[PDB]
Paper text:
The set of protein arginine methyltransferases (PRMTs) is a family of enzymes that catalyze the transfer of a methyl group from S-adenosyl-L-methionine (SAM) to the guanidino nitrogen of an arginyl residue to produce S-adenosyl-L-homo-cysteine (SAH) and methyl arginyl residues. TbPRMT6 is the homologue of HsPRMT6 in T. brucei with 31% amino acid identity. The overall monomeric structure of TbPRMT6 consists of three parts: a SAM-binding domain (residues 36–181, blue), a dimerization arm (residues 193–225, yellow), and a β-barrel domain (residues 182–192 and residues 230–368, green).
Structures of apo-TbPRMT6 and in complex with SAH (SAH-TbPRMT6) were resolved and refined at 2.20 Å and 2.35 Å, respectively. Unlike the significant backbone motions observed in CARM1 and DOT1L active sites, cofactor binding primarily induced side-chain rearrangements in TbPRMT6 active site. Without SAH, the guanidine group of R39 of helix αZ and the imidazole ring of H318 of the THW loop point out from the active site. The comparison of the apo-TbPRMT6 and SAH-TbPRMT6 structures revealed the fine rearrangements of the TbPRMT6 active site upon SAH binding, which is critical for substrate binding, as demonstrated by an ITC assay.
Residue numbers in the entry:
A (entry chain A): 25 to 227, 230 to 367
B (entry chain B): 26 to 226, 229 to 368
The structure:
């Protein structure tokens, strides 16, 4: 069921606020034509109409589209929103000219000004909808060119960013395992905690991490301009970042707890994303309210971890990692993440 | 494995029942106890702490190896013997072999108490009662060979399946209607009905709001754990009649119906209590939630939609025959069927 997932977008205050504010405070909506790709409940389309859009094309391939038409009617907006119950890909296959001829009156003199969408998946790409958004963007820009309009469509969100940070797993182990298992009605069950923890780590980990796990605030790994980004880039996203732990407040926090002759080991890397539009940002960092997306953690091998093979003295040092986020097939909807020190 | 047993350890009601029952028993101190399906071994360790002469801890999963370490960790190794096998395999070994292997620990006492948490969903489903029955019979045979005739004390000593008619409307409201009613000024009610309508597809394992109850609940099945034999487990069935005229839970809804309105029945919810001495572990909707929740069996959608089973404000009488039947010969998996009277 599609209402399954959509509910938690509507349940998430950060996601709701980001889109509400971006739409209700943008300059290209009132009197303009908007496209909502993968509109599900149609919340974004309805916000756009309410905000005074000339017209909204709501694109939703699932059977939920029939019901969205009903909800649009229930909120008295059937005149401002047309639901296209089809995939972006099939609409494109029908062609520009056919689309123009059919929707000529709604398109108006200025064609499509804004493209709204929530396409993000885990670590921004995994199970995401980004390719459809890109294909939709190019399609509607050709629709616009057919009408003599070359103004680039404004994208919401307009930019996205993948962030990465090294982590220590000890704050996670402490808070999630060690403190529960230390005392069970006066019995020492710590052995159970260690077992539960080691094996949970072996079973990419999508979980909310305690902020204390961070050995560094995080660095930008990949940045996308949603107006210009093309599909070809999505095959393999890769970059190399270098953490200066000597300058990191997060690292020093741990450096303190290890004493003055202590060591700080790295257990892995956590990955999250932000998207933005204008002054607004929706973030999935461990320091932000959690979301369905949580954070994605990639651990170093158990031996590297257990033997503390990647560690630093209490005054810090430098750490470099090359990360690859790679499509596992041609849909560009499913990804893996690998890293190399 | 461990994930499950953590939930037991995380449930205050369950922990409290067993701890208080073990403390209340007059039959533990100086005597031998068997803990069937001991998991973390928490029950065995409580029994040891309560002064048992010795404890046989029976756990067939890989946890057994780890429970041996936790026992040693708490200096209980001379008190607890962990048998890393199934009840059935230990039984297959025979009375003589068991007597021989554990002669010194058995002494002249034999086994005086059998501890276990065997309960499944609505007491039978995915539970291990048959294994507990076999264990009890086997240890009473070991006892006879030892000259001991006293019946083994079972904790819990009794179990009861409870059933009540329900209305789903307070569920609809609290889980669906309240949420979808207003989404930032928008009426998304149509989605809530879709979501609720489909979700009602059979038996529903879910925590139901007590407000759903149309009667406080009636005993359907009662087991004496010392005496119950396997043969009764094939088809457990009975008929109960609910007096809705004298029911406070029904008046709750009678009041809100109006003098001309009616109160309709959407189905029946099933739960269980187990007890020992003055203590009771309950999984009723009015009790703190537990992993077993409650199990709800709904009437057909037509009977629910056309309110075919309904009562005037004065109430009336509702009869139901319920069958809880084994779906195979293991007696661990069950189906629930009902018929209105």
């Amino acid at each position: 069921s599609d209402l399954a997932v959509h509910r938690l977008m509507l349940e998430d205050a950060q996601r709701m606020s980001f889109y509400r504010k971006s739409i209700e405070q943008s300059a290209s909506i009132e009197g303009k034509v908007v496209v909502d790709v993968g509109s599900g409940t149609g919340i974004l389309s309805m916000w756009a109409a309410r905000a005074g859009a000339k017209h909204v094309f709501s694109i939703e391939a699932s059977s939920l589209s029939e019901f969205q038409i009903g909800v649009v009617e229930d909120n008295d907006l059937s005149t401002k929103i047309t639901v296209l119950g089809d995939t972006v890909e099939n609409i494109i296959a029908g062609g520009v000219a056919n689309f123009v001829n059919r929707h000529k009156a709604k398109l108006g003199k200025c064609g499509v000004a804004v493209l709204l969408s929530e396409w993000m998946g885990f670590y921004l790409f995994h199970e995401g909808m980004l390719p459809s958004v890109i294909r939709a963007r190019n399609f509607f820009q050709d629709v616009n060119a057919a009408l003599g309009v070359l103004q680039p469509i404004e994208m919401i969100p307009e930019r996205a960013t993948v962030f990465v940070a090294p982590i220590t797993c000890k704050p996670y182990y402490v808070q999630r395992y060690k403190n529960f298992w230390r005392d069970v009605d006066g019995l020492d069950f710590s052995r159970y905690g260690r077992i539960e923890y080691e094996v949970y780590l072996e079973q990419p980990l999508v979980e909310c991490l305690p902020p204390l796990c961070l050995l560094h605030e995080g660095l930008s790994l990949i940045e996308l301009n949603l107006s210009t980004v093309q599909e070809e880039v999505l095959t393999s996203l890769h970059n190399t970042v270098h953490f200066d732990l000597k300058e990191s407040a997060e690292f020093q926090q741990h450096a303190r707890e290890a004493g003055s002759e202590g060591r700080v080991s790295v257990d892995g890397f956590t990955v999250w994303f932000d998207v933005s539009y204008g002054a607004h940002t929706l973030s999935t960092s461990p320091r932000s309210p959690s979301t369905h997306w949580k954070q994605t953690t990639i651990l170093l091998p158990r031996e590297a971890r257990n033997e503390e093979l990647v560690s630093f003295p209490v005054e810090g040092g430098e750490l470099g990692v090359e990360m690859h986020i790679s499509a596992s097939d041609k849909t560009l909807r499913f990804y893996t993440i690998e890293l190399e020190l």
